[model samples]
Target: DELIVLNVSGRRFQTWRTTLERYPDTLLGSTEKEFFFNEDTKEYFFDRDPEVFRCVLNFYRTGKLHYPRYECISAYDDELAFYGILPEIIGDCCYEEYKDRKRENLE
Candidate 1:
């Protein structure tokens, strides 16, 4: 069975990579205040938190992750946009280095 995961927003592969490369410092190992944007609904949400975005980006580049239990919180119970680190893609690019690192350890 394929496990489906939801992220804060859907972005093109290149766009995602560009964001990470451009903001390595803000994203790498930094804690940021949560920010939110509401959609058509008036419900408040917080995703794409600056710090979390950077961390996710670093994870993509280095296969190292520091994910929080709840990446961000939304004022409403609706789904929020949290940055993602796609493990399969990362593993494909850095197979040798990641092969030794167990999936459980990375997740």
Candidate 2:
């Protein structure tokens, strides 16, 4: 019955504790989660992009990492990596484009 709140760059998201427990290895799921918790607001705050975190939260809910068509791959990937979400988990529907974009950005 417990819920968790995450504030990313001033944007807020909420979900049940079980949802975050689905991926225990991730930042939000690990014991270190309290590192970001704010006692005053009762929310875990992150100085990150809310746009990318929306997808991150969705993955916790549905176990699917859907690529954002309009977002920069690096920014999205950075957020994923920060959350301990592997880049290879991108959904089939967006894998090709995700791979293509990564290849295109190779330097």
Candidate 3:
């Protein structure tokens, strides 16, 4: 489990490099001969949306992405798309959150 550092919106996250490269076609698969980081920007500094990438990162950890607070669901979907990941559906933990939000809306 080698550590990989990612810079998103000035926030940094570390994960197993093996985890990111698990899917060869995704943005994290630079080692698989697909995506490339520019020489000028530096290797570890990846500018991206941290909030949304949180979902992307979680997808790797859990194979699911919680629906961000309603306003961000669409934007989060865009993040998944950008990374070549299929849009995530409501994960179990978030389903409870979803149910609560729905009940509040109907009140």
Candidate 4:
């Protein structure tokens, strides 16, 4: 009964509510999440990149932020910001790439 659906960029993802509650400060865990709730569809809707959201969802479930190398760093970082997660929390395995990309952007 704890199942909840989140639709991002038309891609639907299903997970447990308690799973999101692990990070109480995040948009997915906070009261703000209700703003995205769709009463009719019985799901939360987000007009965001589905690929980036998959990473965000994983962070809620596993407590790890694994970046997708193919994703634009700015867009991925924006999604994390939108969810109330800090860019600093990105796992070191991915952090190097994230930093490298940022450096590349400034060059």
Best by lDDT: 4
Clashing pairs in 4: none
What TM value does model 3 have? 0.65
How many backbone collisions does model 4 have? Answer: 0
Go through the candidates in order and give each one's C-alpha lDDT: 0.36, 0.89, 0.66, 0.90
What is the C-alpha lDDT profile of model 4 across 1-107, one tens digit per residue?
Answer: 49999999899999998888888878998879999999998999999889989999998888889989988887887888899999899998889988999888778
lDDT of 1 at 6: 19
Order of models, best lDDT first: 4, 2, 3, 1
C-alpha TM-score for every candidate:
0.25, 0.94, 0.65, 0.94
Evaluate residue 54 in candidate 2 and report its C-alpha lDDT on the 0 to 100 scale: 94
TM-score between candidate 2 and the true structure: 0.94
- Model 1 alpha-carbon drift over 4 Å, by segment: 1-47, 68-81, 84-107
Better candidate by TM-score, 1 or 4: 4
The pairs that clash in candidate 1 are: 8-81, 8-82, 27-54
Candidate 2 weakest lDDT stretch, 10 residues: 25-34
Model 4 Cα RMSD, 1 decimal = 1.1
lDDT tens digits by residue: candidate 3, 2-81: 87667676788888877776566677655532244445654456556788788777777776767677545545556767
Candidate 4's TM-score: 0.94
Measured with C-alpha atoms, the lDDT of residue 100 in candidate 2 is 89
